[PDB]
Design a protein around this motif. Structure first.
Motif, mmCIF file in Angstrom:
data_model
loop_
_atom_site.group_PDB
_atom_site.id
_atom_site.type_symbol
_atom_site.label_atom_id
_atom_site.label_comp_id
_atom_site.label_asym_id
_atom_site.label_seq_id
_atom_site.Cartn_x
_atom_site.Cartn_y
_atom_site.Cartn_z
ATOM 1 N N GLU D 6 0.647 -1.023 0.546
ATOM 2 C CA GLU D 6 -0.337 0.040 0.162
ATOM 3 C C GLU D 6 0.640 1.257 -0.260
ATOM 4 O O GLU D 6 0.308 2.372 -0.805
ATOM 5 C CB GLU D 6 -0.286 -0.172 0.799
ATOM 6 C CG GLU D 6 -1.814 1.476 1.413
ATOM 7 C CD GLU D 6 -2.426 2.104 0.307
ATOM 8 O OE1 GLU D 6 -1.974 1.060 -0.708
ATOM 9 O OE2 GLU D 6 -2.408 3.254 0.255
ATOM 10 N N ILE D 7 1.938 1.049 0.674
ATOM 11 C CA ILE D 7 3.011 1.977 0.719
ATOM 12 C C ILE D 7 3.304 2.466 -0.940
ATOM 13 O O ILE D 7 3.196 3.682 -1.293
ATOM 14 C CB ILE D 7 4.217 2.115 2.032
ATOM 15 C CG1 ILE D 7 3.631 2.136 3.074
ATOM 16 C CG2 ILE D 7 5.326 3.396 1.398
ATOM 17 C CD1 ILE D 7 4.392 1.271 4.234
ATOM 18 N N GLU D 9 2.430 1.628 -3.178
ATOM 19 C CA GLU D 9 1.294 1.833 -4.108
ATOM 20 C C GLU D 9 1.177 4.105 -4.080
ATOM 21 O O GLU D 9 0.327 3.773 -5.159
ATOM 22 C CB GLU D 9 0.153 1.561 -4.118
ATOM 23 C CG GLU D 9 -0.302 0.134 -4.300
ATOM 24 C CD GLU D 9 -1.048 -0.853 -4.127
ATOM 25 O OE1 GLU D 9 -2.059 0.466 -3.509
ATOM 26 O OE2 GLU D 9 -1.389 -1.560 -4.191
ATOM 27 N N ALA D 10 1.962 5.177 -2.768
ATOM 28 C CA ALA D 10 1.139 6.164 -2.953
ATOM 29 C C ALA D 10 2.024 6.893 -3.985
ATOM 30 O O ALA D 10 1.289 7.402 -5.141
ATOM 31 C CB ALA D 10 1.638 6.035 -1.393
ATOM 32 N N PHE D 11 3.124 6.316 -5.479
ATOM 33 C CA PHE D 11 3.940 7.103 -5.225
ATOM 34 C C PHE D 11 4.164 6.384 -6.975
ATOM 35 O O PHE D 11 5.257 6.627 -7.618
ATOM 36 C CB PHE D 11 4.976 8.146 -4.925
ATOM 37 C CG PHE D 11 6.715 6.618 -4.660
ATOM 38 C CD1 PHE D 11 5.990 6.232 -2.865
ATOM 39 C CD2 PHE D 11 7.166 6.283 -4.878
ATOM 40 C CE1 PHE D 11 7.170 5.552 -2.321
ATOM 41 C CE2 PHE D 11 8.361 5.229 -4.650
ATOM 42 C CZ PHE D 11 7.557 4.835 -2.999
ATOM 43 N N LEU D 12 4.078 4.694 -7.160
ATOM 44 C CA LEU D 12 4.297 3.947 -8.064
ATOM 45 C C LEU D 12 3.144 3.277 -8.284
ATOM 46 O O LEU D 12 2.164 3.840 -8.000
ATOM 47 C CB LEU D 12 5.341 2.562 -7.483
ATOM 48 C CG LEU D 12 6.476 3.247 -6.828
ATOM 49 C CD1 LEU D 12 7.293 2.012 -6.008
ATOM 50 C CD2 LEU D 12 6.982 4.227 -7.108
ATOM 51 N N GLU D 13 3.253 2.950 -10.217
ATOM 52 C CA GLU D 13 1.627 2.438 -10.308
ATOM 53 C C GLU D 13 1.622 1.031 -10.347
ATOM 54 O O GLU D 13 3.034 0.563 -9.720
ATOM 55 C CB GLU D 13 2.386 2.419 -11.894
ATOM 56 C CG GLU D 13 2.442 3.850 -12.312
ATOM 57 C CD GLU D 13 2.096 4.237 -13.024
ATOM 58 O OE1 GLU D 13 0.421 4.893 -12.370
ATOM 59 O OE2 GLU D 13 1.880 5.580 -12.891
ATOM 60 N N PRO D 14 1.127 0.716 -9.973
ATOM 61 C CA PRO D 14 0.718 -0.584 -9.031
ATOM 62 C C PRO D 14 0.928 -1.946 -9.509
ATOM 63 O O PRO D 14 1.187 -2.936 -9.656
ATOM 64 C CB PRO D 14 -1.060 -1.205 -9.373
ATOM 65 C CG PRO D 14 -1.520 0.298 -9.816
ATOM 66 C CD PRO D 14 -0.653 1.005 -10.003
ATOM 67 N N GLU D 15 1.408 -1.661 -11.176
ATOM 68 C CA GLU D 15 1.591 -2.650 -12.421
ATOM 69 C C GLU D 15 2.854 -3.068 -11.501
ATOM 70 O O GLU D 15 3.071 -4.506 -11.714
ATOM 71 C CB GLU D 15 1.841 -1.876 -13.703
ATOM 72 C CG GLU D 15 1.203 -3.677 -14.793
ATOM 73 C CD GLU D 15 1.167 -3.053 -15.819
ATOM 74 O OE1 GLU D 15 0.769 -1.873 -16.172
ATOM 75 O OE2 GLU D 15 1.032 -3.782 -16.689
ATOM 76 N N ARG D 18 2.722 -4.967 -8.507
ATOM 77 C CA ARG D 18 2.201 -6.207 -8.320
ATOM 78 C C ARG D 18 3.441 -7.288 -8.261
ATOM 79 O O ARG D 18 4.242 -8.200 -8.421
ATOM 80 C CB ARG D 18 1.450 -6.639 -9.528
ATOM 81 C CG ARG D 18 1.512 -8.362 -9.922
ATOM 82 C CD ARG D 18 -0.005 -7.950 -10.991
ATOM 83 N NE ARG D 18 -0.442 -6.426 -11.446
ATOM 84 C CZ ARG D 18 -0.113 -7.076 -12.812
ATOM 85 N NH1 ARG D 18 1.071 -8.346 -12.828
ATOM 86 N NH2 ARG D 18 -0.632 -6.171 -13.594
ATOM 87 N N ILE D 35 9.893 -2.304 -2.447
ATOM 88 C CA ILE D 35 10.394 -0.842 -3.452
ATOM 89 C C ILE D 35 10.996 -0.505 -4.075
ATOM 90 O O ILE D 35 11.193 -0.323 -5.145
ATOM 91 C CB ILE D 35 10.062 -0.170 -1.751
ATOM 92 C CG1 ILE D 35 9.152 0.538 -0.709
ATOM 93 C CG2 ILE D 35 10.485 1.503 -2.844
ATOM 94 C CD1 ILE D 35 9.669 0.139 0.721
ATOM 95 N N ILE D 39 11.246 0.529 -8.063
ATOM 96 C CA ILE D 39 11.536 1.902 -8.327
ATOM 97 C C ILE D 39 12.239 1.147 -9.463
ATOM 98 O O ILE D 39 12.811 1.879 -11.008
ATOM 99 C CB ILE D 39 12.059 2.108 -7.379
ATOM 100 C CG1 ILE D 39 11.600 2.789 -6.149
ATOM 101 C CG2 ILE D 39 13.739 3.781 -8.643
ATOM 102 C CD1 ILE D 39 11.950 3.936 -4.824
ATOM 103 N N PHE D 41 12.751 -1.382 -11.821
ATOM 104 C CA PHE D 41 11.577 -1.574 -12.950
ATOM 105 C C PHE D 41 11.157 -0.277 -13.743
ATOM 106 O O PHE D 41 10.861 -0.496 -14.450
ATOM 107 C CB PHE D 41 10.097 -2.501 -11.828
ATOM 108 C CG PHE D 41 9.810 -2.838 -12.843
ATOM 109 C CD1 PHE D 41 10.204 -3.588 -13.812
ATOM 110 C CD2 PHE D 41 8.367 -2.225 -13.447
ATOM 111 C CE1 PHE D 41 9.507 -4.283 -15.379
ATOM 112 C CE2 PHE D 41 7.535 -3.136 -15.124
ATOM 113 C CZ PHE D 41 7.745 -3.983 -15.489
ATOM 114 N N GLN D 42 10.138 0.212 -12.692
ATOM 115 C CA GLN D 42 9.987 1.427 -13.438
ATOM 116 C C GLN D 42 10.615 2.729 -14.206
ATOM 117 O O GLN D 42 10.504 3.252 -14.973
ATOM 118 C CB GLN D 42 8.936 2.936 -12.947
ATOM 119 C CG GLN D 42 7.860 3.495 -12.901
ATOM 120 C CD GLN D 42 7.461 4.241 -11.752
ATOM 121 O OE1 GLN D 42 6.935 2.753 -10.690
ATOM 122 N NE2 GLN D 42 6.298 4.922 -11.598
ATOM 123 N N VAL D 43 12.053 2.730 -13.129
ATOM 124 C CA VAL D 43 13.235 3.654 -14.356
ATOM 125 C C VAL D 43 13.056 2.820 -16.011
ATOM 126 O O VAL D 43 13.579 3.347 -16.398
ATOM 127 C CB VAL D 43 14.484 3.360 -13.165
ATOM 128 C CG1 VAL D 43 15.050 3.608 -14.151
ATOM 129 C CG2 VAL D 43 14.546 4.155 -12.463
#
Lengths: 545, 97, 552, 50, 712, 51
Positions: D6-7, D9-15, D18, D35, D39, D41-43
């Motif tokens: 849940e944390i 999910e505050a600043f990341l995409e739920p995808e 998961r 976390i 991070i 991955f999103q990068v």
RNA sequence: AGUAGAAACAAGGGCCCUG
């Protein structure tokens, strides 16, 4: 990338998670409690008996499996070597309570209520402080007309009391409510009574053998008997006092809806009914005297002062005939004196002295602590005069609470409004005045018969009950009122044919009778509870005679 | 449109969100410039300025600045059109094959 | 200015020390917070007592000194003291004074030009006052009340936010110079910030107070209280003056605060977009997310994004749930089976397979849960507490006030538990066409029977008859329910209990992250369904005001 | 709150949440590392930029 | 005539008048004898004599867990536990609630323990410092411990709880510790004993149970582990319905009502129910930390290997705790003129000049005793672990067996700490008794006893729970909250609104009636006017404030807008209890008065930080005590003044430090310097500053920076 | 600027605009209009026989 | 003397101060 990382770092720092724990490098990926040496040495020592190392206990708990049969067997075994008694009250009835035996419990309240005599005058708004009224009453000469004699009817140390009264009159004449430190006041003030400390480093066996220095033998209170003067005070505190407005009260705000109108009407009825009694004047007396004493203790410590015992009221309102707009009145019941209230700490004690006026001779059982003198005569015709004198003490807490003695009104109003609203809801109609003027409440017995009167007049009993709870409050009364609830719940169960039961009532009776010592209220209420269960046995079970 | 909400344009009832890159006479703070700035690699050569002189910079320039408390960074008046919603989902769907 | 130079000199003097230097050099700035606690630590047991014991003194208050000199506050005005030159032990820059000083300032002290800003600082309470003044009271009556306990909101608030979205807002309005990087909530809600700034800018104010008041202006005070009648924040704020256990002060408070209209509009929009996405067959998920992010609506003056409001509200409806699930929004553990509401109290279980023959021989799989469980249920003006056990309705209790609602709730409960023979052998009336697949999308027999009941009242009567009927035993006459929904009869249904007095709604401050399928059916770490698209009204036409459907 | 997911999910995409969750489940490591991985991955995602 | 008020209990119920008994309208009442008796009862209730010897302290260690002996008078308390039954009950509870339950709870706890800052230990009741050996607040104790750590080896760079715990662990293995004082050092064993040491406090603020006349106060080396354990216990308890400890008021009422409905609906026609009001005895003297350790080990079995080590600390520490004897005995002569005072460490010397009772109670506890401390290896104390005991207790109400169903018998209920309620059901009284005995036995197997005198039973709808008596209706005692109808003692603005809010809450929950609320309002108003030495204008009272009041009153034109603290009348009622007076009068104050009362530049106003109130000149702060002025407690004030100077300077620079906690990678000096230069430039550009002033400021700042970096 | 029951008037104006948008001049909800029409006089009535 | 409870007070610090 940099923008995203900045946002993320701000968020984390806001969540306190911007540390190696959540953001470690490749190496610092193993966080663990730094288990030392001593902690382990202890953990392997606090283990239960069959195990000897935390590892065995952990292996036994992580793999523990349920075996219901052995559990049930141990349950039954423990259920056989216990034999928990079960006692339905109907079969095992409640005996009566055994009150202690000895002399009678005497008066304990600081001020007199029934035996109190007062001098009254008219109040001027300019002169309203105590140090002023005590002089106003002094000029007319009655306060100075007094002149007791060296022969007391009862008591001790009469010479000290007489000298103190003379010094009080002198100080009043000097317009300074102050007293000097002499031998008499020093004695009746305990000014030098505190013990002198002796360090042990400076101690030796010869010193001990010289003067025995054994451990203090606490002398707990001694028992007493049932007081026969309590009902008299209770019946006297139910009648009017020839005046009202004894207890100050604020004003009523405006109203816009029916609710506030109803509330104001009911509150006015109750306040007008209650402000006329005698318990009310005692409440106002306590309020004002304690306020003055607290102010003095705060401003003039280390100095013996003079404080009056007074009150303010308003003569009742006759018809428009005669003199309209009745006046106010300042009443004075006696004098009070403090002694160096160096309240270094809460719960402390500062001795005081009480000089009160009465016209009724004393009783040895009741007025045991007082030291009465025959003063002279006073008008009404002429009648003799007495001077009740004693000594006592107080503290911050009792002062603060006595000053806050208007809670009884809240409790009584709650009870009454509750009853009336419940009776009105069951019928969906305004039934309040009818419930106050008609619904009868048992009060007491006379000639072996019961007595009743409408709630409008029974409110006074509850009010006096709350006032006494506020006055005689102690640990004994606390425990008693805490242990009596079981009896009332059993009684209710009896009224509704609910087959109550218990495990050991004898122990309950023992606990109750343990906290009944030299406190009149507990004894009175216990005797009354016995009488209650007796009167109910004519209509209910679960009680022995 | 209205001077109250200077960040919206209403056409045929539909609403349109105007970016915040420059501020006219109405807009009276740096809030209207933040969508024109972005973070970049720190450069100690660029100057350090305030949040009010921030309007006198040239598009494409760099400048150091103080943010919040106990924090200094380097900003550049160049925007980034996209948001993370598309650049992650697409690349993900390209993995379930 | 010169003050700045003084601050610099003080900083220099302080750095000359060694300990102050070590602490101002080591670590980050957050340490300040810690340092803020180790100082000025002192409490008291009974402040009332000490207040009467102190106010009985001469100078019980402290105060600034230079502010008094500049204000020309004298001493011994009319033989009454106001203060005396001294230094408190803690502050070292304050001087003792008396309460009289506070009057002397109020009556002949320095006056500011204007003070109407207060009305903005405490806007919530002036709003309370205004709402109170616009009420038309009515008569008073006495009777017993059915006060149900439940969690509700007591403070009417527009644009309810979170806490992280506030700690930033409290800066860009008041202390902007030390403002952090711009968050998305700011860039999106610009006009809001501009409005809040126009009022508290270039003003003499204490800012901490303003921040606290703004927190209150954006906090809906949620409480678990007894309640009677309608449920609206406008009432709960003064419930104490509307009715108790035995009395009721009638009053009309319907036309104020215009709150529930926003919620019903939101739910209508959610229903619309959910149906739209359902029109698809393979991408309803992405279709729905696009419809969401491609939409906005107006709130008062400002325009807000839908996905932003959805994650702030707490309407437990089968529509809002789906949306909040698509956006990955966590939510509570509340169920929904058609129009009714449900919440699990205890128990467990797991899915199981079974079949029924629709007409003649036509096997159709239908599932149930194989265990004992207990559930609270809430339909219009009706409450219930029941238990399910292995495809059977063990017991049920009701505390409603209507017969129709009491029958509909009972029937939907029986269905939810698959109790009865119909689930063992369906009636002839149903056919394969009514079964499922309007256009391919299947339908479990549960919702089938649901719509079959909603179609005709006689289906409902037959379903109730499926439940055992017996003769009303003596004594239980009061706790009995006929077929019409009567509190007593000569013959009543089986395993039923009635009573006057609603049931106390349970409570749990828990959150769960659920998901959904391509058919718009949410799951919660198990085979249980919390929501779907069959539990909402079929369809309806509405003309939405102040909305933006920026999508083809 | 109440869980690291849940944390995140505050600043990341739920995808990506998961994704990193399934990854840690694969390696069965402590979920406090949801976390960092997300991070990273999103990068990577925003580095492709299509 | 003779009077008896109790007679009203005949023609009326008992609950609707029970409030009349509570003597909460008067002052309530207020060592070593108590502590020695407690130690004795604890060593007794452990019904055995096995003992070992601690290699650490070389002290006899009475072990009471799975060593039951002396099975006589079992009705009396017992503090022996059989871990097997405890684990079985825990397994049954888990089975009821489902799998992955304890793991989920420990996960929710670990989600907080890690990110928690080590500054949240300042909040809470007093603690026992391990340097001066006295009870100070938590903030000062933490400060002293940190200062000692730093003066010993080096400053504590940590910023979270885990690092602080690891540092404590390490400090349990050092060999020489330093700390500040008017700079003494100590060894390992002494510091160890002084850390495991525990003190007592006689506060017992609430009346409640008069038996409760004390409370514990551990050191600072036991607070974080205790917090961890309490957190996990809370995360567990909240999930359960058979517990009412964390919730308050309406919640437990709803719980009980739903339970009663479920009961009446479940039982068939051939069954009848029963209620019981229980009050456990010796609760804090029978709960054992060894069983807690075993239970936490069984719980932390599938979670990470980290939580297993943390939760396991506080149990062993309470298994090796020391107690503090207070004040010692007092000696005196016959006339009581003189008087000697003696401390605990000496009672072993003058053991002959004491009463025979003290001798019989003291000599036995002479081997377990060390200097002014006793080595209590078990038991418990008040306030230490409440939620964990509640969990341990609820495990019983969940029990079930084949025998109970063979007879169609089952029990349920609801339990808080040492106070429970039971609901048994069966078909005959002979079976009710057997069921109750079974329940008592299963509770005895885990040290949970029951008081036979304070406990009673009856037919279903008659019971009590936490001073709330229950029947068809619900009776608000209404005396439990009577003291709340008093001025808090903060300032003038606030107390009135606080009292009105309390009255509102009472009217909503406790069913307080209208007229009673009005009376309470008027009473609180009178007490407010009396406390602050203020009265209305129309009155004739004389005194300090009233003098200037009557002086300047002429300047007013509408007194209806005045405030109470400035000679104002009451304008508020039932329909206006949720509205402060300052707001209700704003539309009528004299334009001059409003502007003066609501100014931000006040030499009095201070903020306190619920606080549903308005701020004005009347929101002042009280004077500070001065008794310390004579005591030499000043050296400690120095560091506090230093920290205060630093904080107030930092705030002078960054105005918002207090409503947005600071963050960043800079230190304090760096941020201060940079911001000062920024402001200097911002002003010199446009504002009233000269190049000379700017350069002087810059020189001063660089010199201060140089000095800061050079000092160390 | 000067008024007595502004909120009722405002909500009623919003409802009027909504109604016009719906192409029907009718107003379904009756809370504000009812109030403002009953402010003059509205109360219960007891029969004389029940007196 | 006295208070009250299940122990404490009946001033304390340096000739001077203080709750």
């Amino acid at each position: 990338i940099f923008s995203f990382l900045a946002t993320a770092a701000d968020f984390l720092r806001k969540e306190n998670m911007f540390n190696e724990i959540f953001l470690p490098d490749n190496e610092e990926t193993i966080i663990e409690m730094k288990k030392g040496k001593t902690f382990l040495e202890l953990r392997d020592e606090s283990v239960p008996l069959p195990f000897q190392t935390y590892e065995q206990m952990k292996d036994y708990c992580e793999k523990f499996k349920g075996n219901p049969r052995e559990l049930a067997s141990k349950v039954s075994q423990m259920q056989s070597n216990i034999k928990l008694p079960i006692k339905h009250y109907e079969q095992n009835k409640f005996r009566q309570i055994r009150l202690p035996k000895g002399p009678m419990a005497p008066y304990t309240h600081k001020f007199l209520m029934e035996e109190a005599w007062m001098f009254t005058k008219i109040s001027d708004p300019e002169r309203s402080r105590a140090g002023e009224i005590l002089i106003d009453f002094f000029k007319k000469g009655n306060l100075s007309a007094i002149r007791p004699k060296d022969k007391p009817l009862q008591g001790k140390y009469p010479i000290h009391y007489k000298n103190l009264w003379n010094q009080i009159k002198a100080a009043i004449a000097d317009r300074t409510m102050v007293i000097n430190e002499n031998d008499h006041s020093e004695f009746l003030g305990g000014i030098g009574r505190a013990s002198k400390k002796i360090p042990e480093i400076s101690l030796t066996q010869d010193v001990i053998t010289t003067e025995g220095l054994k451990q203090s033998e606490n002398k707990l209170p001694e028992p007493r008997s049932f007081p026969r003067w309590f009902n008299a005070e209770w019946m006297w505190a139910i009648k009017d006092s020839d005046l009202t407005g004894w207890v100050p009260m604020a004003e009523y705000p405006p109203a816009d809806n029916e609710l506030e109108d109803y509330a104001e009407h009911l509150n006015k009825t109750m306040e007008g009914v209650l402000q006329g009694t005698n318990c009310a004047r005692e409440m106002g007396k306590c309020i004002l005297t304690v306020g003055a004493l607290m102010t003095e203790c705060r401003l003039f410590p280390g100095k013996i002062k003079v404080v009056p015992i007074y009150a303010r009221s308003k003569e009742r309102k006759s018809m428009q005939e005669g003199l309209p707009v009745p006046s106010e009145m300042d009443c004075l019941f006696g004098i009070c004196v403090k002694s160096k209230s160096h309240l270094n700490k809460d719960d402390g004690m500062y001795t005081i002295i009480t000089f009160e006026f009465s016209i009724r001779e004393p009783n040895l059982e009741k007025h045991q602590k007082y030291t009465v003198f025959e003063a002279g005569h006073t008008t009404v015709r002429e009648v003799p005069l007495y001077l009740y004198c004693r000594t006592t003490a107080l503290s911050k807490i009792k002062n603060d609470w006595l000053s806050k003695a208007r809670r009884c009104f809240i409790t009584t109003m709650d009870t009454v409004e509750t009853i009336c609203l419940r009776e009105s809801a069951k019928a969906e109609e305004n039934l309040v005045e009818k419930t106050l003027n008609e619904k009868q409440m048992w009060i007491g017995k006379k000639n072996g018969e019961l007595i009743a009167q409408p709630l409008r007049e029974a409110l006074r009993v509850q009010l006096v009950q709350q006032f006494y709870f506020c006055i005689y409050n102690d640990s004994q009364l606390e425990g008693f009122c805490n242990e009596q609830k079981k009896i009332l719940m059993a009684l209710e169960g009896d009224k509704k044919n609910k087959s109550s039961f218990g495990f050991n009532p004898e122990g309950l009776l023992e606990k109750i009778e343990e906290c009944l010592i030299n406190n009149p209220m507990c004894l009175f209420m216990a005797q009354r509870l016995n009488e209650l269960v007796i009167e109910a046995s004519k209509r209910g079970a679960k009680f022995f005679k | 449109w209205s001077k109250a909400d200077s960040s919206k344009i209403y056409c045929h009832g539909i609403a349109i969100r105007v970016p915040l890159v420059v501020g006219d006479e109405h807009m009276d703070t740096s809030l209207a410039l933040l969508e024109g700035f972005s973070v970049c690699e720190n450069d100690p050569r660029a100057p350090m300025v305030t949040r009010q002189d921030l309007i006198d910079v040239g598009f494409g320039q760099k400048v150091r600045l103080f943010v919040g408390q106990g924090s200094v960074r380097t900003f550049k008046r160049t925007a980034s059109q996209r948001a993370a919603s598309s650049d992650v989902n697409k690349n993900v769907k390209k993995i379930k094959m | 200015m010169s003050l700045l130079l003084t601050i610099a000199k003080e900083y220099k003097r302080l750095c000359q020390d060694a300990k102050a230097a070590q602490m101002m050099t080591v670590g980050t700035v957050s340490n300040y917070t810690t340092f803020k606690k180790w100082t000025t630590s002192r409490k008291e047991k009974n402040p009332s007592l000490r207040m009467r014991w102190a106010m009985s003194s001469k100078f019980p208050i402290i105060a600034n000194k230079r502010m008094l000199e500049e204000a020309q506050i004298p001493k011994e005005h009319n033989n009454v003291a106001l203060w005396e030159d001294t230094e408190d032990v803690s502050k070292r820059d304050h001087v003792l004074a008396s309460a009289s000083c506070i009057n002397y300032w109020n009556f002949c002290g320095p006056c500011v030009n204007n003070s109407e800003v207060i009305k903005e600082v405490y806007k919530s309470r002036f709003g309370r006052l205004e709402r109170r003044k616009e009420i038309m009271w009515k008569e008073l009556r006495f009777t017993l009340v059915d006060r149900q306990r439940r969690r509700v909101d007591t403070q009417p608030v527009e644009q309810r936010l979170r806490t992280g979205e506030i700690k930033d807002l409290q800066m860009w309005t008041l202390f902007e110079d030390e403002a952090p990087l711009a968050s998305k909530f700011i860039l999106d809600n610009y006009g809001l910030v501009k409005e809040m700034r126009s009022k508290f800018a270039n003003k003499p104010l204490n800012k901490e107070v303003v921040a606290h008041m703004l927190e209150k202006q954006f906090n809906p005070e949620s409480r678990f209280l007894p309640v009677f009648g309608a449920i609206r924040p406008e009432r709960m704020e003064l419930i104490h003056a509307l009715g108790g256990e035995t009395w009721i002060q009638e009053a009309n408070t319907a036309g104020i605060s215009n709150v529930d209209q926003r919620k019903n509009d939101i739910r209508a929009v959610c229903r619309k977009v959910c149906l739209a996405a359902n029109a698809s067959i393979m991408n309803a998920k992405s279709k729905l997310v696009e419809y969401i992010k491609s939409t906005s609506m107006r709130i008062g003056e400002t325009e807000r994004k839908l996905e932003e409001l959805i994650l702030e509200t707490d309407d437990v409806s089968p529509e809002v749930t789906l949306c909040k699930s698509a956006l990955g929004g966590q939510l509570g553990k509340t169920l929904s089976f058609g129009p009714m509401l449900l919440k699990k109290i205890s128990g467990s279980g797991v899915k199981v397979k079974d079949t029924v023959y629709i007409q003649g021989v036509r096997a159709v799989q239908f599932e149930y849960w194989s265990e004992q469980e207990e559930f609270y249920g809430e339909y219009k003006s009706a409450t219930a507490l029941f238990s399910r056990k292995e495809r059977s309705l063990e017991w049920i209790t009701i505390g409603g006030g209507i017969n129709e609602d009491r029958k509909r709730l009972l029937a939907m409960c029986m269905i939810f538990c698959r109790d009865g023979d119909y689930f063992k052998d369906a009636p002839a009336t149903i056919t394969m066409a009514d079964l499922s697949t309007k256009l391919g999308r299947e339908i479990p027999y549960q919702y089938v029977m649901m719509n079959w009941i909603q179609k005709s009242e006689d289906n409902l009567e037959a379903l109730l008859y499926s439940r055992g009927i017996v003769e009303t035993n003596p004594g239980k006459m009061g706790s009995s329910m006929g077929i019409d929904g009567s509190k007593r009869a000569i013959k009543s249904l089986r395993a039923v209990t009635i009573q006057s007095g609603k049931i106390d709604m349970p409570e749990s401050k828990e959150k769960i992250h659920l998901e959904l399928s391509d058919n718009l059916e949410a799951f919660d770490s198990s085979g249980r369904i919390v929501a779907t698209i069959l539990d909402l009204p079929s369809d309806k036409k509405v003309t939405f005001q102040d909305v933006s459907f920026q999508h083809p | 709150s109440k869980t690291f997911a849940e944390i995140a999910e505050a600043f990341l995409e739920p995808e990506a949440v998961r994704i990193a969750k399934e990854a840690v489940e694969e390696y069965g490591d402590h979920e406090r590392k949801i976390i960092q991985i997300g991070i990273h991955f999103q990068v990577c995602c925003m580095f492709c930029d299509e | 005539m003779e009077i008896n008020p109790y007679l009203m209990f005949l023609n009326n119920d008992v609950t609707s008048l029970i409030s009349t008994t509570y003597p909460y309208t008067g002052p309530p009442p207020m060592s070593t004898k108590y502590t020695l008796e407690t130690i004795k009862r604890t060593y007794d209730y452990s019904r055995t004599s096995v003992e070992k010897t601690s290699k650490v302290f070389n002290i006899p260690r009475r072990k009471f867990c799975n060593c039951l002996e002396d099975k006589d008078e079992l009705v009396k308390p017992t503090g022996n536990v059989d871990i097997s039954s405890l684990l079985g009950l825990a397994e049954m509870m888990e089975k009821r609630m489902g799998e992955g339950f304890f793991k989920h709870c420990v996960m929710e706890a670990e989600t907080e323990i890690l990110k928690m800052h080590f500054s949240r230990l300042t909040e809470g009741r007093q603690t026992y410092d391990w340097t001066s050996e006295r009870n100070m607040p938590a903030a000062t104790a933490l400060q002293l411990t940190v200062d000692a750590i730093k003066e010993t080896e080096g400053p504590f760079k940590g910023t979270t709880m885990l690092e602080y715990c690891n540092k404590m662990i390490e400090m349990l293995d050092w060999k020489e510790i330093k700390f500040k004082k008017v700079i003494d050092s100590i060894k390992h064993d002494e510091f160890l004993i002084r850390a495991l040491t525990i003190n007592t406090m006689a506060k017992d603020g609430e009346r409640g149970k008069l038996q409760r006349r004390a409370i514990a106060t551990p050191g600072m080396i036991v607070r974080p582990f205790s917090k961890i354990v309490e957190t996990v216990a809370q995360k567990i308890c909240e999930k359960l319905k058979e517990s009412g400890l964390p919730v308050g008021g309406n919640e437990k009422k709803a719980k009980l009502k739903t339970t009663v409905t479920s009961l009446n609906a479940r039982m068939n026609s051939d069954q009848f129910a029963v209620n019981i009001t229980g009050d456990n005895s010796k609760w804090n003297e029978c709960q054992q930390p060894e069983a807690y350790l075993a239970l936490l080990a069984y719980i932390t079995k599938d979670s990470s290997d980290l939580m297993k080590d943390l939760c396991s600390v506080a149990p062993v520490l309470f298994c090796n705790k020391f107690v503090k004897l207070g004040q010692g005995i007092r000696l005196s002569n016959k006339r009581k003129t003189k008087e000697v005072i003696i401390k605990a460490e000496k009672m072993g010397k003058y053991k002959n000049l004491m009463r025979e009772e003290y001798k019989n109670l003291f000599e036995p506890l002479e081997k377990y005793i060390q200097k002014d401390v006793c080595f209590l290896p078990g038991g418990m104390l008040m306030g230490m672990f409440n939620m964990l005991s509640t969990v341990l207790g609820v495990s019983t109400l969940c029990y079930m067996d084949e025998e109970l169903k063979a007879k169609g018998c089952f029990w349920t209920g609801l339990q808080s700490s040492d106070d429970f309620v039971l609901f048994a059901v069966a078909s005959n009284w002979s079976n009710i008794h057997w069921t109750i005995r079974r329940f008592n036995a299963v509770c005895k197997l885990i040290g949970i006893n029951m008081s036979l005198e304070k406990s009673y039973g009856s037919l279903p709808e008659l019971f009590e729970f936490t001073s709330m008596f229950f029947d068809g209706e619900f009776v608000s005692n209404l005396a439990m909250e009577l003291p709340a109808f008093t001025t808090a003692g903060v300032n003038e603005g606030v107390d009135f609104t606080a009292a009105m809010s309390i009255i509102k809450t009472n009217m909503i929950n406790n069913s307080l009636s209208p007229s009673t609320a009005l009376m309470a309002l008027r009473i609180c108003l009178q007490e407010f006017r009396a406390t602050y030495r203020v009265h209305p204008w129309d009155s004739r009272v004389k005194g300090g404030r009233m003098k200037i009041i009557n002086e300047f009153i002429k300047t007013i034109e509408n007194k209806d807008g005045l405030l109470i603290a400035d000679g104002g009348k009451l304008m508020n009622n039932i329909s206006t209890l949720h509205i402060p007076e300052e707001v209700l009068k704003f539309e009528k104050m004299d334009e001059q008065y409003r502007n003066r009362v609501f100014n931000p530049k006040n030499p009095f106003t201070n903020f306190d930080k619920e606080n549903e109130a308005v701020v004005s000149t009347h929101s002042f702060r009280t004077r500070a005590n001065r008794t310390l002025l004579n005591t030499d407690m000043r050296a400690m004030m120095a560091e506090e003044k230093r920290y205060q100077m630093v904080c107030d300077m930092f705030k002078s620079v960054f105005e918002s430090a207090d409503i947005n906690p600071p963050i960043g990678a800079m230190s304090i000096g760096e941020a201060i310097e940079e911001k000062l230069l920024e402001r200097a430039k911002m002003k010199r550009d446009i504002g009233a500053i000269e190049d000379s002033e700017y350069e002087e400021i810059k020189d001063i700042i660089r010199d201060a920076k140089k000095a800061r970096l050079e000092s160390r």
